[PDB]
Design a protein around this nucleic acid. Structure first.
Ligand code: ADP
Ligand code: ADP
Ligand code: ADP
Ligand code: ALF
Ligand code: ALF
Ligand code: ALF
Ligand code: MG
Ligand code: MG
Ligand code: MG
Lengths: 448, 448, 448, 72
DNA sequence: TTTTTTTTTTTTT
């Protein structure tokens, strides 16, 4: 047989130390748990100790024995005699921390051994599973294994370091001669004033009713970001084919009414402008488009990381749109499915340190009011969409609802939420023919 | 014991097939390589086959045997009889793609199993490797597996590739001088100016209140499409029998009061007209009607596929109407059921590259308003009907609501949504007696 | 054999505190009496002290032993050795309030058990008593327990008290305000009156819709508490990084527009203020902040206990926020998951004797009503959140829902539950620019 | 034990023909379903045959053998 | 147990 590696000595030394000195119990708790012990009796003893400590009862040779007898585990663990021997074996809890780390290492080693065993079985007995299923399983297991190594060293501890880290960041920004913009440059001056660009590690959201221009606005931000920096920008078009996205972006950049592009009725001047656009796009070559439909959060993470690894980071990620992503595990409760997707995307932004722009739809309840301007509570199926987002922008075009409105060809970007900035409204011009939003150079109206 | 996966018979078939026809060499070569086989002699044969192909020698039994004999590997792989048996068990060369695909799958599984065994070997014996290194090896191996796939799943695509495809599409659209109608001809020139025909891969929707002409308009679109092209058009009439539909079509095409047709009080001229219509329809023979009730999305897709396969493709398919379809799995929640149906209809359009015209009903909230023209948010039970649709046309006849209206017999096609294109209104004369919508020759009223 | 509940340590601690300090004997006597103990000798001792107080003689070891010896009770209570031991058990006389309350609580439980035993006795042997007699006896006993509690907020005030309060407060008002506060300072004088500060062992709750100052308010409480005491405070920020939290604190304490801090567009004057703030914080060094994500009730307890032991207790604990904690065991029923989380926090709060502030979200039903002020039924997934909470505060800002409202920059704190004291509304000024709340110095509108 | 009415020979002919040709799959899909077959072995083969067909893959002994092997 | 989206009927301002 292949006996998994273990060191019962470390477990026994820890157990004796806990029974001798209960103060050092934190040292054991911060490195190992009840399930890290190779021998099951140790696991039962640790669990009983945790229950007694949580009740305020001291961890000694009498209280632990009494608790085990009451719960009936005193027979399985061996009895008071086994606890007495553990007390004798351990000299003192002076070096308990070292033993705890060893037990943690053994427990980790047991876990990765089990994962290897599970993977081998799956390959030997796929039971009809396709290659992708095992691949994602391997990725998830690796992520789970690395999870214990993510945040397991330190907790709250210092404040001095917090001030040192914080003051350092202010100094770096202060020295950098930037014009207020600190994130990605949106491309619209009025929007940069309020948002100061798309900040890294943020979950931005764009919402509006159908055919308001959620994709038209989002692709404009993508184009501006690509032209105003160097890092790659990644697009997930779960709804429209890559070809249709390109025709819109080809009409916007070159300013050629997309009706001709779609229909092919182009003159010589239009061919000249389209050629100019193609030259610029192919010179940079930092835009990636993925038009696969129905992607799970795991697949989004996998493809985003791969692009970052190859090209040394990402600058922006666009998703179109939230509700189209799938989580097969939570396929019964739609509300829980949407909550899981939102949490994952926020985590992805923090992990890669890159703004994530995800579009969203709106409820019909908006359409039963006299004032049809969206509010935070309109997001569709939005369990936690409002609670997790760092910035929420709504697109409202008045002319859609009132044919006599004076605001003809004007769109309002309503900032519905912002954790670290003011909220308000920004007015832009909408040129549908070119699939473009432009700065509203016209007369400015103060926002109440 | 555990036997690593492999398909000896498939390995035999792939080897056997290419000896007859070598044109499929690229198909086999790109999909699979000599490393994919599990049996060494087969690897030797393919290695010889690739060498002969690279040398310009035709792939055949005689050339293979000669090369093996010269290299001395003929004894290892067998001989004239062994190689003859290789081709004997091949079912068909045309299928070689599946055999090659099978071989790739077996090799992929073997590769995964080997990686799992390698991971287990590394995990069981650290060999001086720390826990972090073991994580790195697992990550590297997983990435290699995801790297060896060679796409096969449509990952993110660079922008250079997308531009090449899009510009090619525009250039070819330039050559064909259709002058406005890129898709199926609707038959109403005022409607083509906006929609530019019914584009393939679209989910068109026609909605209106009961007895507004919803099935009368859709049938007019179907009749015009059938007479203006050559591909079959399929009709799913879940609401009315096939006889009633045909009774209307005879009245429309032949322009005979449908009351006489339904009642039988026909004259000589009416018989002459109907005979003329019958001759035309039987000359083309490209209309199919399926009046089964309560079809599920699966049955709709299966039947459409069969018609496309048998007759070389479809030109248009019409559904009457959306809300009558059933999804037995999701019957507790009507909102989820309708969302599932809408998604399926959009997916079907993409698969067959055909426009799908699905009718829909409207809410009663329209009837509590002073203005009774429909809007997007009136579609009945419509969770995602407004979001998935690429074009929404509403039928509104003002004479129904205001008796003294000036628009007596003038229907309006209100385009409530169009993803790629403008929105507006089109006026058509409504001849209910003939069950027909005609072009409105009257003065053009500018749309606001 | 079921042992009636009691608290021996509380009895011993109360006796020792009374022996040490005599001015607080009245408070203990009012809260608890001799009969409120569980052991007869301790009841005898309490009678001895009450007799001494009636005579006015000082209460201490010498006097207590003298009285016991004269009455012959010295041997009954174990002699002078146990008298000294009673004080030896007591850490200090100031903490006698909590111990007396425990003694009263056990006394109430004992009385309830006795009444229940009497009820069973009568029912088992009617002796001829009619059901009415049994029911009347049970009803009278229940009223005795319910009414024999004193406390406050137990009914409508009569006339004599009202008249004296009316004249007394009229006379006091025209001379001086005479504010008492007398509580664990929250920094806002108007809030101390209605809460008497944050009482230890409670489980305070703060709730509001997204982007309502929920985290801004909690941080202000943490800052004010830190300056006005010496015990360490702890923060569990499960949503925002420690950097962002610290940035807000610097803006709030130094009264500097936080947009400049985020963008780094500071000047010499602002840098002077920030430098002053950093000096004060580092002078104290009693704030600990943990930004680990997805903690569990076990993890927070272990970390909180470790901090307390290292530095000798915690003055306050803040969590942001409740719904983000995770319990893998109960990872199927969210309602049970939240129930366990709330229970664990309450257990920790009383175990350490430290106030615990936990934030929470609200449903979307609030926004459906015409009156948008929160209510206790709006807590999200509130299986037991309302039950365990000892104090609930809601944050409301009418300016959010009404641009023309006259309450611009005014936030209302709505107390929806409280163990002692009334429930009402507290007004404050919300300076979002500095991420701060300020006392509503303006015209204090009478609350209706 | 009264013999339930069933015809193995017809089932064997149907399964074999479908192996020979793929263009008649529609002819049998409407007429029969997996539950129609009497013996469980035939039911398993038809289910695998349908799974391959709806996947748009050719029908043959090798493909069927592998597909059945995948599910055990 | 909780959160979400759709219908239809009543009562009030
Ligand atoms: N050639 C054109 N002329 C005028 N308007 C157009 C043209 N092409 C598209 N539009 C308008 O632009 C809008 C863009 O819609 P879209 O970006 O799809 O919004 P969403 O992505 O939120 O559904 C549509 O409402 C459409 O009416
Ligand atoms: N002989 C006729 N004369 C006048 N109007 C007719 C005649 N036959 C049918 N119609 C009208 O045609 C309209 C459209 O019918 P239909 O297309 O079935 O409505 P929908 O399918 O939208 O429910 C009906 O309102 C009906 O009154
Ligand atoms: N510079 C600023 N000017 C005006 N308002 C601001 C500024 N900075 C922050 N705010 C406001 O302070 C509020 C604090 O939000 P926050 O406490 O994060 O919400 P939550 O209650 O969900 O924690 C935000 O709604 C934001 O609008
Ligand atoms: F067509 Al949409 F958001 F309504 F892309
Ligand atoms: F009669 Al209908 F749609 F209302 F065909
Ligand atoms: F901005 Al929040 F909870 F909505 F911190
Ligand atoms: Mg879109
Ligand atoms: Mg109809
Ligand atoms: Mg917050």
């Amino acid at each position: 047989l292949k006996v998994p590696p273990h060191s019962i000595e470390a477990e026994q030394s820890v157990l004796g130390g806990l029974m001798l000195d209960n103060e050092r119990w934190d040292d054991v708790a911060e490195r190992v748990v009840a399930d890290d012990f190779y021998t099951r009796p140790h696991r039962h003893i640790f669990t009983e100790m945790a229950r007694l400590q949580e009740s305020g009862s001291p961890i000694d040779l009498i209280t632990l024995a009494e608790s085990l007898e009451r719960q009936g585990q005193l027979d399985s663990v061996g009895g008071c005699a086994y606890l007495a021997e553990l007390s004798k074996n351990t000299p003192s809890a002076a070096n308990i921390s070292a033993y705890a780390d060893i037990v943690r290492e053994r427990a980790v080693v047991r876990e990765m051994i089990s994962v290897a065993n599970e993977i081998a079985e799956a390959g030997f007995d796929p039971q009809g599973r396709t290659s992708e299923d095992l691949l994602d399983l391997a990725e998830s297991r690796v992520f789970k294994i690395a999870e214990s190594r993510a945040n397991k060293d330190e907790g709250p501890k210092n404040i001095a370091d917090v001030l040192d880290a914080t003051v350092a960041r202010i100094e770096q920004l202060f020295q950098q001669p930037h014009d207020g913009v600190t994130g990605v440059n949106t491309g619209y001056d009025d929007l940069n004033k309020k948002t100061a660009g798309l900040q890294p590690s943020d979950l931005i959201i764009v919402a509006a009713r159908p055919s308001m221009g959620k994709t038209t606005f989002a692709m404009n931000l993508v184009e501006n970001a690509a032209m105003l920096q160097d890092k790659p920008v990644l697009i997930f078009s779960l709804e429209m084919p890559s070809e249709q996205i390109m025709m819109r972006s080809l009409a916007s950049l070159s300013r050629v009414d997309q009706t001709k592009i779609r229909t092919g009725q182009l003159d010589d001047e239009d061919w000249a402008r389209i050629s100019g656009t193609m030259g610029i796009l192919l010179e940079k070559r930092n835009i990636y488009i993925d038009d696969s439909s129905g992607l799970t959060p795991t697949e989004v993470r996998s493809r985003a990381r791969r692009i970052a690894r190859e090209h040394g980071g990402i600058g922006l990620i666009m998703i179109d749109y939230l509700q189209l992503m799938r989580v097969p595990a939570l396929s019964d409760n739609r509300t829980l499915e949407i909550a899981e997707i939102s949490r994952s995307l926020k985590a992805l932004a923090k992990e890669l340190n890159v703004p994530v722009v995800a579009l969203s739809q709106l409820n019909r309840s908006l359409e039963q009011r006299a004032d049809k301007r969206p509010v935070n509570s309109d997001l569709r199926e939005s369990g936690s969409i409002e609670q997790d987002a760092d910035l929420i922008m709504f697109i409202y075009r008045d002319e859609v609802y009132h044919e006599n409105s004076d605001l003809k060809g004007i769109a309002e970007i309503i900032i519905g939420k912002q954790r670290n900035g003011p909220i308000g409204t920004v007015r832009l011009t909408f040129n549908g023919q070119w699939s473009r939003f432009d700065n509203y150079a016209g007369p400015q109206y103060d926002d109440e």
